[model samples]
Target: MNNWTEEEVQKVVAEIGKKAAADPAFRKLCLANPTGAVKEVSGKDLPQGLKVRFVENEGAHMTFVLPDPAGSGELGEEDLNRVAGG
Candidate 1:
């Protein structure tokens, strides 16, 4: 459709999340061609002038988390090592 609403966008995202969690085939198809897959699921292709960026978050992990002034300890070499997955 020409005009897309926030509700429609949210609904489509929720549906996609559900499908991706349960349907590997659908997920692969979606990953292969996001615009077309979204159009199939949402039943509305993006507007001609609109663009969407889709990315794959392939098992990214945070090595270290900040424990703030509560720690009251300065982040020295030890903390840096933690961040580096030491």
Candidate 2:
């Protein structure tokens, strides 16, 4: 399995969200996945060094608050934007 940068994973999530918004069937299929509808950039079989969570109840929410890889205890805005989309 190849290691994917956080940016790549965020892009995947964005695309998924955009698609989900356009197709109800696809949304249902995504939410049906065991991983709570969110997937890593490299698919299910790959190992992720980052933490990603999907919350769904009345609506859907995705979080990507990973620890700083550089040990500085601070994450960059660009990194957060990966999931935030802006």
Candidate 3:
């Protein structure tokens, strides 16, 4: 596992969110994950909606991405486990 500082992580997340907010698509994507720390992947070739991924550590990290309207997306416990274990 990696040892990370909460303050530093928060600073990184804040910067990421600020950058994300600059893009209309990314801003909408941010709404999908209120918390910042995880990375998200698009669910389909083209996405019309957003999906969320949550990362858990000393602090939570979330990432949002636009997924194809017809694609299936979900937040799985395994993903959280990996984040925590990592």
Candidate 4:
């Protein structure tokens, strides 16, 4: 994720989102085992214990860190709402 460009990231998400929505089994596997599920979709090996974990988020919102933010940064709720507002 950190290595991908913004357009690459969006393109991957679009494909994955479409596949997840269209295939119940893929969606179930994603919820149960993210690493395995991605392998199923991508048809590639998981690099032997690498790419072994994930976090599944649920709620009205999700937050993402920039791939190339300067220094380490933090955003308060007000900042978040301001971004979401537009």
Candidate 5:
């Protein structure tokens, strides 16, 4: 994956959001094909394995991101117990 600074990522998001706000066709493209739309808007390819999605935040609608769970890949004691008990 590319090592993009947080600042750079924010700039890209802002630019894409601005374009989508002004261009209906672009907004549709973004919602349907974010990778292509981002490439068109930024003139830069996302690093390999990166994926993006866009959704409109209309009235009475919002989006929230749930980050990866803490200790994501590590098995907890319960998991170990399950295997041991099996």
Candidate 6:
């Protein structure tokens, strides 16, 4: 089971965003191979079964993500938090 947290993911994303904005070559690499690009930027290789993608929003445009529906059976025990919250 992986131990990474959501905040770490957000930090990686923010770092990549800044680098992509500043470096056109890096931005191209990110578009071409997001997994490798993330490894290069974060110095951490992504685990198997995980995937990443990069997208750009041009002028006058926006993009949003539609997350997976609940109870899809795609999740396993490893994906859940063990502790209960009140």
Candidate 3: worst-modelled 10 consecutive residues by lDDT: 40-49
lDDT of 4 by residue, 2-85 (tens): 333457444544555566667755566555555455555455543321223233335512221112321324322233223221
What ranges in model 6 sit over 4 Å off? Answer: 1-3, 60-86
In terms of TM-score, how similar is model 4 to the real structure? 0.42
**Higher-TM-score candidate of 1 and 3:** 1
Candidates in order have lDDT scores of 0.49, 0.45, 0.37, 0.42, 0.49, 0.51
- lDDT (Cα, 0-100) at 11 in candidate 6: 71
Between prediction 4 and prediction 6, which has the larger lDDT?
6
Compare candidates 2 and 3 on TM-score and give the better one: 2
After superposition, the stretches of candidate 4 with alpha carbons farther than 4 Å from their true spots are 1-12, 55-86
lDDT of 1 by residue, 1-86 (tens): 23566666667666766676677666775655555666767777556434343444446211111112223244333422131211
Which lDDT value does model 5 have at 11?
A: 70
Runs of candidate 2 exceeding 4 Å displacement: 34-44, 48-52, 57-86
Clashing pairs in model 4, backbone N/Cα/C closer than 3 A: none
Error of 5 at 33 (Å): 0.9
TM-scores of all candidate predictions against the true structure: 0.57, 0.44, 0.31, 0.42, 0.57, 0.61
Tens-digit lDDT track of model 5 for 8-83: 6567667766776677666676655565665675566655433343455776232211112233353333322121
Per-residue lDDT tens digits for candidate 2, residues 1-86, read 23545686567667666666677665665545413344433354424333333444344543222223433344344443244321
Worst 10 residues of 1 by lDDT: 61-70
Error of 6 at 54 (Å): 2.1
Model 6, residue 22: C-alpha shift (Å): 0.8
Which candidate, 1 or 4, would have the higher lDDT against the true structure?
1
